[PDB]
Amino acid sequence: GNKRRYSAWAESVTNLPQVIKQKLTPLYELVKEVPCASVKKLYLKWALEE
Amino acid sequence: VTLMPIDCELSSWSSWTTCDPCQKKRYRYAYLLQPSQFHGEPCNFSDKEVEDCVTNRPCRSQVRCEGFVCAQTGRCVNRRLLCNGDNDCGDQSDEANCRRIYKKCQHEMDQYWGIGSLASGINLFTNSFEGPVLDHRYYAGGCSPHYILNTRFRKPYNVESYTPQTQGKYEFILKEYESYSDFERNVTEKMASKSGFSFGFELGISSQSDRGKHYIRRTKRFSHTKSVFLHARSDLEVAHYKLKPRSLMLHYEFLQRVKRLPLEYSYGEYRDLFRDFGTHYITEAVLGGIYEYTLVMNKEAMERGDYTLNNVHACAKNDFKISLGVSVGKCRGILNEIKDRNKRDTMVEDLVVLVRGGASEHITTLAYQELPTADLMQEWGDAVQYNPAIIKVKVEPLYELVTATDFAYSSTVRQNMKQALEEFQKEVSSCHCAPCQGNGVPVLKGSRCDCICPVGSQGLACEVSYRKNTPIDGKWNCWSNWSSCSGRRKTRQRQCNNPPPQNGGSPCSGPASETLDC
Amino acid sequence: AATPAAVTCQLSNWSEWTDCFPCQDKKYRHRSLLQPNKFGGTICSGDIWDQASCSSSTTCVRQAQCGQDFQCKETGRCLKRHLVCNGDQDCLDGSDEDDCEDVRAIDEDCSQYEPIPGSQKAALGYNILTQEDAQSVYDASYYGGQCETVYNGEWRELRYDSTCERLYYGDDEKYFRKPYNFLKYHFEALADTGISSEFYDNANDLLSKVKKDKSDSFHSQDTSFLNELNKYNEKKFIFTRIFTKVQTAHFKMRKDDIMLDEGMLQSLMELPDQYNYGMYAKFINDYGTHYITSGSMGGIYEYILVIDKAKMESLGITSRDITTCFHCKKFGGGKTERARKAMAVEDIISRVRGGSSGWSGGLAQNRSTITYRSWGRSLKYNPVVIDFEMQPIHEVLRHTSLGPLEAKRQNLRRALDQYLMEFNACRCGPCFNNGVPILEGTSCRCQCRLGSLGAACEQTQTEGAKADGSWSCWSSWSVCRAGIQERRRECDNPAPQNGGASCPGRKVQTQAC
Ligand SMILES: *[C@@H]1O[C@H](CO)[C@@H](O[C@@H]2O[C@H](CO)[C@@H](O)[C@H](O)[C@H]2NC(C)=O)[C@H](O)[C@H]1NC(C)=O
């Protein structure tokens, strides 16, 4: 590809970047602020296993 | 005659249903037994019939609205959504007579580009948008800052996210193949013979015989085959849309049409509902554009050339001299010559191009037969941001919108929709049609069936082509009825277009037979 | 075939005047078209339909067509009263917006968005016999107080602010107000192209030569025979088809509470509940046999090129020569003949339906990246109805706000059934050489493709070519002696001239008594 096109793309990425590297945390760690939150957090752990 | 127009057939009526206690009406309907095709007569647009009734019984009042009632629409809206500075009714009732309107969204805010398309239901069996089912202009407050580049948007209440997850996949495959083969011979025969006698004795006798023969044969054969395959495709993705899972605000029109559905099951009304709004709505979609180019070239040349020659000579002279003299010269010949030359040149080309999303300028220039300039592909992909197609869709059936929050007898309506939808999938299938010729695909189009004729085919049945023979792909006939319960089963004869004829193409899809629990 | 003869257009006598319609003060009567002028000949100056002023001697008792609904003075449009003083003139009278003291009666702040351009053609009726737009069926300008808008995905339009150097897209026309009758108007940019190209070229050559010579001499005798044949055959065939279909809209017309055009509304109320063929015929002739309820908005281009060349050349010669010598005598004789025939025929049709006279002409002349791009740009501004579905004009009645109308609807159905087999193009005579018969009003044409000339396309610059048959008109219905009736039609108008296609449909038709 052209030097111009690559350059311009690499510029535009600064404004529409995507996630390319991530470190994950399990989703059940967010089960919070709800009735039976502590129980739902375990059932979501088990459901992720399933 | 080759073609024979087949007129629409539709069943005798159902019974009249019992009078609907809410609608104070009764209903009757018919099934499309046979779509019209090949310029057949179309049936009257009266597969539904309706009657009024005496109110043999009352019914439940329309579901209580705890909120404010929008005068014209009757949209039940929350009292916090009055004097809001927004129209939440589709009507000014909410804002009508407000002593003070507290503008929340004071800034300049755009709607998400094409977001209102996604509020349209789709007919999944056609994959085609229908009437609006969801109101994506209802904001219910909101006014969180959402930006794309420098442009800030106001998200609909219904939409969970609309986010510019940009991506692009190009794919280019070019395959060129050549073969030539050449064959010649040259072959020659010549024969010459002489025999003569000359003697003295007085007496004298002489004889001479002359023989010449030539034979020549030549043969030439040539074959040249030249084949080009060129498939190019661009998949561009520009935004990810997801609908909220819960508490959707329906469009007025869909709301009302639902409100008018009969409580007793009668297929005709749910059929009309699907024909207005379709069967499913879009929960999650990937928005972007497609470009796809596919060229096929076959160049086949053959030459055959033959030469045959025969030559024959005979002369005989016999002379007897003793005065006395007698002589005879006797000579004869035949020549034979044959030349035979046969040449054929055949070129078959087809191209198909396909584009979705973007501006008409770019769409059409990409629809020309030449592969595009990178510049015009840039311009097209720029313009797809603003007018994208829907590449990926995840859909839920429309009955999942029918919710007690909105409708009396919600469960009953829901179940009716399930039943109706199941019948609708049968009645709208393309399987019903008579087969096209010419490898045509019958597309059922309401009460009549259209053959989409391929590239290089023409006419109502695709019967016109200059290609003598081309592979015909197999097409299923309609799946059988449900087998009576001892287990449940269906079968498909793969018959409606025979897969084998004319160098028959692909066999039909699997399964040929489908079985289930009752 | 020699030219057919002109016929004079011929009409039946006037039907009697209808009794003077109390609300209208009009008498009506119709003729029926007994013969169009066909292959030239005197057109009728008489019209098929006539109307005259007449005082009825009786009041318009029916004038109270509506009660609680607001009825406009000029016109029977009856509006749901929230529309009165709603800020939008919902009838041509404008009386619904007249004397409105309460300005806050306005329904909504919608008017900044103008109606969808090109939405009006979806309103117009359609005449399947002539493929011509009629008068409006739908009210293309009616919103019902609603403010449904449509996102115009092509809204981008470059603007350059000289004072700033900013190069930007003007926001104008980002949305359009959707008229009430449109259920949907899905902007959706699609294109599909299809090309095929097939070349078949074959050339064959033969030569065959015989010599047969005998000499026998002492008195001298000498006999020679020659037979030679040469025969050349060449056939060259090129066919290429280009179909590029561009789409920008899908629109669908509401099946419920269709707000008829005011003119249609009036014209409809004027129809008698009793059958009167002339009245309904006039109605159909005005509003068209058919009205439309599905649409795509597009540009289309189609290119077809067919070239056939064939050359055949033959030489034959024979000689036999004979000799008797010793005085000398010589003889000979035989047969020789020579012929060449060649022909080439080529034609192209290039047609564009789409958004600019200049560029659609250019692209009809010249296919290229330049004409495709500039025509595509032009399709931004003047897209065209590229496909549509339609229903018989009478089926709207079921779907109107008015109610049953079932007397009118059945009358209109009968009238249509007649009209489609009175003004039918089949009744114009045989157009030869794949000419298309057209019946406009009381008069016929044959539209001739360029190979043909003359009133019937009958004379052709070449002497004979494959041209297809077409149906005669249906005969009259039989008497139905049983509960069943018959009708008969023959593929003889014209017969297939040179073994073109026999016309495909039914030869025989049958009907419930
Ligand atoms: C058959 O004979 C012809 C005539 O000699 C051959 O073609 C010639 O080949 C020579 C040498 O390659 C060339 O110089 C001539 O110009 C050719 N003349 C023509 C008319 O082709 C041919 O190659 C021979 N074929 C075989 C199979 O022997």
Side-chain angles (χ1 to χ4, degrees), chain A, chain B, chain C residues 1-243 245-513:
Chain A
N2 325 107
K3 285 52 203 168
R4 288 190 185 150
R5 298 191 198 284
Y6 182 72
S7 310
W9 176 73
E11 193 196 39
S12 77
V13 291
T14 65
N15 296 304
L16 293 173
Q18 293 277 81
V19 177
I20 64 179
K21 307 185 64 176
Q22 71 279 359
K23 285 184 169 70
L24 299 181
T25 295
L27 187 72
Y28 70 79
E29 303 290 6
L30 295 186
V31 179
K32 193 176 66 160
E33 207 216 325
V34 294
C36 284
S38 309
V39 170
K40 286 169 178 172
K41 188 153 62 180
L42 298 187
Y43 299 159
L44 185 57
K45 187 195 297 184
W46 301 353
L48 288 162
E49 257 296 358
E50 193 153 344
Chain B
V1 292
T2 59
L3 304 184
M4 178 65 180
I6 61 184
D7 301 338
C8 178
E9 297 296 345
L10 75 84
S11 68
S12 58
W13 303 104
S14 70
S15 181
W16 286 109
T17 188
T18 188
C19 290
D20 182 301
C22 306
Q23 311 304 338
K24 62 176 68 74
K25 284 171 189 292
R26 69 176 207 262
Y27 305 97
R28 186 172 69 150
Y29 73 89
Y31 289 99
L32 180 169
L33 299 182
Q34 187 172 30
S36 59
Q37 191 171 356
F38 311 130
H39 270 310
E41 188 262 19
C43 37
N44 51 49
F45 179 55
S46 57
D47 71 44
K48 174 185 69 181
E49 267 300 350
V50 190
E51 265 296 357
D52 301 294
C53 291
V54 296
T55 47
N56 296 106
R57 192 175 64 260
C59 94
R60 285 264 312 98
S61 306
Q62 265 191 23
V63 67
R64 184 189 298 155
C65 169
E66 193 178 11
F68 180 69
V69 183
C70 307
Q72 272 60 245
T73 65
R75 187 178 281 177
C76 196
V77 302
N78 304 320
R79 281 171 188 79
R80 77 185 193 85
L81 302 181
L82 302 172
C83 319
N84 43 312
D86 311 304
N87 179 324
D88 298 317
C89 299
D91 158 44
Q92 293 293 114
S93 179
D94 57 340
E95 299 259 70
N97 83 76
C98 289
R99 155 181 74 133
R100 179 173 177 153
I101 311 77
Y102 298 94
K103 292 201 64 186
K104 191 193 288 284
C105 276
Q106 190 58 23
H107 309 281
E108 299 300 320
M109 315 194 108
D110 300 68
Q111 315 183 21
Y112 293 125
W113 307 311
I115 209 79
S117 300
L118 295 149
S120 317
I122 74 169
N123 191 333
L124 188 60
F125 317 139
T126 87
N127 191 47
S128 202
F129 306 84
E130 302 293 16
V133 304
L134 293 152
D135 188 351
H136 290 9
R137 291 195 295 160
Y138 178 62
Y139 303 123
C143 213
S144 175
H146 302 282
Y147 281 68
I148 301 181
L149 307 174
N150 206 70
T151 310
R152 71 187 296 151
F153 299 76
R154 200 178 182 179
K155 188 177 62 56
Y157 158 79
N158 284 311
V159 175
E160 178 165 17
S161 297
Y162 183 109
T163 181
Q165 283 170 36
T166 65
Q167 167 184 330
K169 180 186 173 182
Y170 196 69
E171 170 191 300
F172 190 98
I173 84 166
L174 179 62
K175 311 179 186 175
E176 317 185 47
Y177 306 149
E178 293 207 50
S179 179
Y180 72 66
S181 60
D182 184 5
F183 167 34
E184 309 192 331
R185 287 165 175 169
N186 284 5
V187 193
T188 292
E189 309 184 355
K190 295 188 178 182
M191 320 306 128
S193 68
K194 302 180 182 179
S195 293
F197 300 80
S198 306
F199 290 89
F201 307 93
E202 296 80 48
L203 165 69
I205 301 184
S206 192
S207 175
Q208 180 64 255
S209 181
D210 193 323
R211 213 29 179 177
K213 180 179 177 181
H214 318 359
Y215 164 100
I216 301 177
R217 168 63 175 273
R218 306 187 189 166
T219 286
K220 181 177 194 294
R221 298 192 71 146
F222 184 25
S223 171
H224 200 171
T225 199
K226 185 175 182 177
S227 188
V228 189
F229 184 98
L230 171 51
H231 177 98
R233 176 167 172 141
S234 195
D235 298 286
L236 181 70
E237 306 174 10
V238 285
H240 184 81
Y241 161 95
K242 206 187 160 285
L243 198 75
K244 280 184 184 177
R246 206 180 294 277
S247 306
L248 299 165
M249 189 72 102
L250 308 182
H251 205 64
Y252 174 75
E253 297 272 38
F254 179 63
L255 200 71
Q256 291 299 319
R257 282 281 297 97
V258 178
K259 290 279 184 80
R260 296 172 196 145
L261 293 170
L263 179 61
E264 298 74 16
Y265 183 85
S266 61
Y267 172 54
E269 304 309 309
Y270 304 92
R271 180 166 65 200
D272 276 5
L273 194 77
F274 310 143
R275 288 200 291 208
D276 306 335
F277 303 105
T279 62
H280 295 69
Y281 75 104
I282 307 174
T283 74
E284 202 167 35
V286 184
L287 316 177
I290 290 158
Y291 169 64
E292 176 182 12
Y293 182 106
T294 175
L295 170 62
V296 165
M297 179 154 189
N298 322 289
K299 195 186 178 180
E300 292 83 333
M302 101 177 165
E303 186 175 51
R304 183 180 63 257
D306 299 309
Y307 180 116
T308 310
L309 175 148
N310 296 287
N311 296 8
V312 186
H313 305 97
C315 307
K317 198 176 62 74
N318 314 340
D319 322 64
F320 321 70
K321 186 278 171 198
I322 322 169
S323 62
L324 311 161
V326 64
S327 181
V328 60
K330 189 270 183 166
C331 202
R332 172 173 178 272
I334 289 176
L335 180 147
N336 184 13
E337 179 182 54
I338 309 172
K339 191 178 176 69
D340 183 5
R341 186 190 187 180
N342 315 98
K343 187 187 297 181
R344 179 166 294 154
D345 192 351
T346 205
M347 164 144 183
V348 185
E349 169 175 337
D350 301 311
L351 167 67
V352 171
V353 194
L354 173 150
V355 203
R356 277 100 182 95
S360 69
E361 178 176 332
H362 308 315
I363 282 299
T364 69
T365 183
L366 293 187
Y368 184 44
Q369 71 216 39
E370 303 183 37
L371 284 168
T373 307
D375 297 359
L376 301 179
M377 287 288 277
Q378 173 173 352
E379 287 191 297
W380 177 66
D382 176 79
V384 171
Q385 306 163 20
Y386 309 92
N387 186 23
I390 296 144
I391 308 316
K392 258 214 188 182
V393 82
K394 304 184 177 291
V395 298
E396 287 199 325
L398 205 65
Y399 64 70
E400 292 294 294
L401 300 177
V402 178
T403 55
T405 192
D406 299 312
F407 315 113
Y409 314 101
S410 68
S411 320
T412 87
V413 174
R414 204 193 148 265
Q415 196 57 240
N416 299 343
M417 286 187 153
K418 298 196 178 191
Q419 185 178 357
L421 181 57
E422 176 180 336
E423 289 199 69
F424 189 77
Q425 190 170 23
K426 307 183 182 184
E427 189 173 46
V428 312
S429 62
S430 293
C431 78
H432 288 290
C433 296
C436 307
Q437 304 187 3
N439 207 40
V441 181
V443 176
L444 186 63
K445 197 81 178 182
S447 325
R448 69 183 197 67
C449 199
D450 280 334
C451 287
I452 306 185
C453 306
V455 64
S457 183
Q458 303 166 116
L460 290 292
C462 325
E463 70 284 4
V464 181
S465 188
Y466 307 105
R467 275 155 267 196
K468 317 180 176 182
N469 83 63
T470 51
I472 306 306
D473 304 288
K475 301 290 198 288
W476 293 351
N477 63 301
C478 299
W479 52 79
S480 71
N481 300 77
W482 292 116
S483 308
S484 185
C485 181
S486 185
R488 178 165 184 160
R489 189 222 73 266
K490 303 188 298 178
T491 62
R492 296 164 173 78
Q493 291 52 48
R494 290 180 156 187
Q495 185 35 10
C496 182
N497 206 352
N498 316 316
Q502 319 315 333
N503 165 7
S506 185
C508 317
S509 189
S513 64
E514 176 176 25
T515 190
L516 209 72
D517 298 344
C518 310
Chain C
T3 184
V7 311
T8 62
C9 175
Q10 188 183 354
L11 313 176
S12 61
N13 306 306
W14 295 108
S15 53
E16 189 40 51
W17 296 106
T18 57
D19 51 289
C20 307
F21 280 103
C23 306
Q24 303 175 44
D25 303 323
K26 300 165 189 173
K27 298 155 66 172
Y28 300 91
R29 67 183 181 163
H30 67 287
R31 302 177 279 214
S32 65
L33 168 67
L34 259 52
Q35 199 60 26
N37 54 273
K38 236 167 189 167
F39 297 109
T42 295
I43 77 166
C44 301
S45 86
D47 199 9
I48 299 182
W49 301 302
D50 187 32
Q51 72 167 357
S53 187
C54 173
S55 57
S56 59
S57 79
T58 189
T59 199
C60 186
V61 297
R62 73 181 63 77
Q63 64 202 332
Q65 304 104 17
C66 306
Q68 72 302 312
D69 302 352
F70 178 99
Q71 180 225 288
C72 308
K73 180 204 160 208
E74 296 277 62
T75 175
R77 179 171 287 185
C78 302
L79 303 174
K80 297 183 179 293
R81 290 194 161 268
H82 68 277
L83 299 177
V84 182
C85 305
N86 71 2
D88 298 353
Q89 288 175 224
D90 291 325
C91 51
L92 272 39
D93 191 12
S95 53
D96 62 300
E97 282 282 287
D98 193 17
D99 67 70
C100 295
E101 304 301 339
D102 180 12
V103 179
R104 288 308 315 144
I106 64 174
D107 264 324
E108 196 156 327
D109 62 330
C110 206
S111 191
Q112 62 279 5
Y113 298 131
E114 67 163 31
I116 295 157
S119 57
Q120 197 217 347
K121 194 185 184 309
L124 310 181
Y126 188 72
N127 185 346
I128 62 158
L129 295 184
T130 67
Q131 313 180 358
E132 291 171 318
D133 295 327
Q135 307 293 318
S136 303
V137 173
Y138 306 84
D139 195 340
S141 302
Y142 179 65
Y143 305 107
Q146 292 152 18
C147 186
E148 298 282 290
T149 56
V150 170
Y151 175 66
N152 166 35
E154 307 211 63
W155 66 267
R156 295 174 80 202
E157 209 267 300
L158 271 182
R159 303 293 172 75
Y160 173 76
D161 190 347
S162 304
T163 73
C164 312
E165 318 289 33
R166 93 180 293 223
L167 193 62
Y168 81 97
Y169 306 93
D171 44 355
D172 312 314
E173 305 176 280
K174 191 173 280 173
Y175 307 86
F176 296 131
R177 191 175 184 190
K178 188 177 59 56
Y180 161 87
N181 293 305
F182 300 97
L183 187 58
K184 86 191 187 188
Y185 202 103
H186 183 45
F187 284 71
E188 190 173 20
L190 311 181
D192 296 15
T193 302
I195 314 195
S196 61
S197 310
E198 328 182 12
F199 190 9
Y200 327 121
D201 192 344
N202 307 269
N204 307 303
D205 181 8
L206 303 200
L207 300 95
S208 305
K209 190 190 302 153
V210 183
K211 319 181 182 183
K212 193 179 301 178
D213 320 327
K214 312 177 301 177
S215 310
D216 184 359
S217 178
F218 302 76
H219 202 58
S220 316
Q221 326 80 307
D222 178 4
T223 187
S224 183
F225 177 55
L226 185 151
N227 180 25
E228 192 268 328
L229 183 145
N230 182 347
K231 201 168 183 287
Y232 186 105
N233 184 32
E234 177 192 324
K235 190 182 176 184
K236 188 180 182 170
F237 187 76
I238 310 160
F239 166 88
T240 182
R241 188 190 216 304
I242 309 162
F243 196 76
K245 175 176 174 183
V246 183
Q247 305 174 54
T248 63
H250 313 83
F251 79 78
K252 197 169 188 169
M253 314 305 291
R254 74 183 315 105
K255 306 291 290 196
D256 77 332
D257 306 349
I258 309 168
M259 193 90 228
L260 303 179
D261 192 42
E262 297 253 52
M264 176 143 187
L265 180 60
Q266 309 152 325
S267 311
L268 181 59
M269 309 275 91
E270 295 160 12
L271 314 177
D273 299 343
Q274 185 173 6
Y275 190 74
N276 178 290
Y277 182 48
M279 302 286 275
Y280 294 95
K282 189 67 192 304
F283 194 82
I284 304 153
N285 171 96
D286 305 353
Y287 305 100
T289 57
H290 284 71
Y291 79 104
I292 279 172
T293 67
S294 189
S296 55
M297 299 285 287
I300 272 184
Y301 166 60
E302 178 173 70
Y303 189 105
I304 318 169
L305 182 150
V306 189
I307 323 169
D308 305 20
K309 321 186 181 182
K311 320 159 195 158
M312 187 305 288
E313 327 171 28
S314 315
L315 318 97
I317 178 158
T318 53
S319 190
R320 203 171 193 106
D321 306 70
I322 55 169
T323 86
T324 192
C325 215
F326 191 74
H327 66 223
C328 200
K329 340 280 185 167
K330 180 76 178 192
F331 290 84
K335 182 177 181 177
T336 182
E337 67 89 4
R338 211 191 65 76
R340 172 173 187 164
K341 64 178 68 176
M343 57 75 58
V345 58
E346 156 181 10
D347 65 271
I348 309 181
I349 84 166
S350 173
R351 61 165 66 110
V352 182
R353 304 187 86 124
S356 165
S357 66
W359 288 110
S360 66
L363 178 63
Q365 188 64 240
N366 170 290
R367 166 164 29 79
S368 59
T369 201
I370 295 184
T371 60
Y372 258 67
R373 188 168 177 156
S374 288
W375 176 67
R377 181 179 290 191
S378 86
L379 287 170
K380 181 176 181 170
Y381 299 110
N382 178 223
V384 168
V385 170
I386 281 310
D387 185 35
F388 63 89
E389 289 292 330
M390 61 182 183
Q391 286 291 347
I393 186 56
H394 61 83
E395 298 285 27
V396 63
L397 309 188
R398 284 183 154 114
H399 300 94
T400 82
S401 66
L402 312 165
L405 290 152
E406 278 295 306
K408 301 195 182 75
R409 196 185 63 66
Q410 302 161 12
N411 303 333
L412 193 55
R413 188 174 287 228
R414 177 188 283 178
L416 192 64
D417 300 342
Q418 196 171 12
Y419 178 96
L420 290 175
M421 289 297 175
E422 173 173 22
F423 299 100
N424 199 292
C426 72
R427 200 142 71 107
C428 301
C431 304
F432 300 103
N433 306 304
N434 299 351
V436 180
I438 312 175
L439 204 171
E440 292 167 10
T442 69
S443 71
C444 292
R445 282 204 310 293
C446 294
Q447 177 171 326
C448 305
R449 58 191 64 254
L450 308 187
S452 306
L453 296 323
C457 311
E458 68 315 319
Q459 74 203 258
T460 304
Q461 164 278 10
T462 51
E463 304 80 352
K466 192 167 63 178
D468 298 345
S470 291
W471 294 110
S472 183
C473 297
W474 290 102
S475 51
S476 177
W477 296 112
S478 74
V479 174
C480 44
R481 303 185 190 285
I484 294 181
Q485 208 165 24
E486 179 170 324
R487 202 175 71 181
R488 282 272 292 196
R489 181 180 71 162
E490 302 280 330
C491 196
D492 79 344
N493 178 50
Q497 185 200 49
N498 312 299
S502 60
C503 59
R506 298 173 64 146
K507 191 179 190 281
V508 184
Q509 168 68 299
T510 186
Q511 161 71 325
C513 188

